[model samples]
Target: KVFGRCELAAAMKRHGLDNYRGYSLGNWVCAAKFESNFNTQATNRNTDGSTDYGILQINSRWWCNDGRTPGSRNLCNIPCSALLSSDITASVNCAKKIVSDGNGMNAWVAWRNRCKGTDVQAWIRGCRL
Candidate 1:
């Protein structure tokens, strides 16, 4: 499902991503914007033979099991397909685990390249959270 900016923001906040791991909600919003444009069904297959799934772009290489990522760690212990669902619970839970694993939000290249060290308030400015 494709979500509008505020809709995505609200959903993410509801799922407990607000200030998760010291990263503000805006940071998560920014990463999701650049990563998958708030589309729950988004999927990207990398040249490295791994795939990024869902709105947060959880990866098959180390996060979820896609059954084809050569050496997948499946740290989330859920199928990559679970991340593509409209209900973002799986995505949010997996993302929290990813952050709690000591990688911080930098686990997402989109966050590092676009959200890190930047004022990301604009991403959630109009949301009523």
Candidate 2:
């Protein structure tokens, strides 16, 4: 299911997003599947002792700690300081980087072939729609 017609479409729109640069529908789906299981309100408890929420499982607090100045008034535009910064563009862009760059999603790949461990890139080598 592509973002334009999938369950994450509305959530993407609410964040002023449209597409993932070099990734495909499967990529997004796979990422979301692993990240938040497609549940917009789903969150994962990190080893860091924090809760990540939304379809993206964004750590709401990243909004402030990640360049969003607190009480800057614009902070209000941010959906959740407890979530990812309201700058959804940047957030998704970052995700795209990871999804495409073997270094991004398959760090394990770089760790293997390039970094010398296992070619994790092979995991999604033939990814499809």
Candidate 3:
């Protein structure tokens, strides 16, 4: 589920995520760059024993159920594995749900740590989009 930048952008566009959910396409691109390196199969175990899933690294703590963790809010009501697909429809839908709750991209530490307040234009450079 790894993606080149252009391919990822095109997929994001197809999913209606270009400038969606109060965030720009650049925000999505940049956040994904750091969170999962655009690899939809990516997952990380957090210090608190929660796992982050897929390109945006949606967490088991609040977003999805993996059955290996506790206190899963399962806000998206989808399996964590669903986010690990190259087809990002479920991921995009869940992301929208996250931003709709006023958290915006703040749900992602990668966005806060690496993408927020930065010039992310290069993420889409040469994408021709």
lDDT of 2: 0.41
lDDT of 2 by residue, 1-129 (tens): 122224454445344333454333444444555565555445455565544544455443332132433332222234433334433454454444434545544422222233233332332344331
RMSD of each: 0.9, 8.6, 1.2
Candidate 1: pairs in clash = none
Best by lDDT: 1
Clashing pairs in 3: none
How many angstroms is residue 47 displaced in model 2 relative to the true structure, after the best TM-score fit? 2.5
TM-score of each: 0.96, 0.42, 0.93
Residue-level lDDT tens digits of model 1 in 87-114: 8899999999998988799899999998
Best by TM-score: 1
| Candidate 3 wrong stretches, greater than 4 Å | none
Candidate closer to the true structure by TM-score (higher is better), 1 or 2: 1
TM-score of candidate 3 versus the correct structure, residues matched by position: 0.93
Note the Cα lDDT for every prediction shown. 0.93, 0.41, 0.87
Worst 10-residue lDDT window for candidate 2 reads 107-116
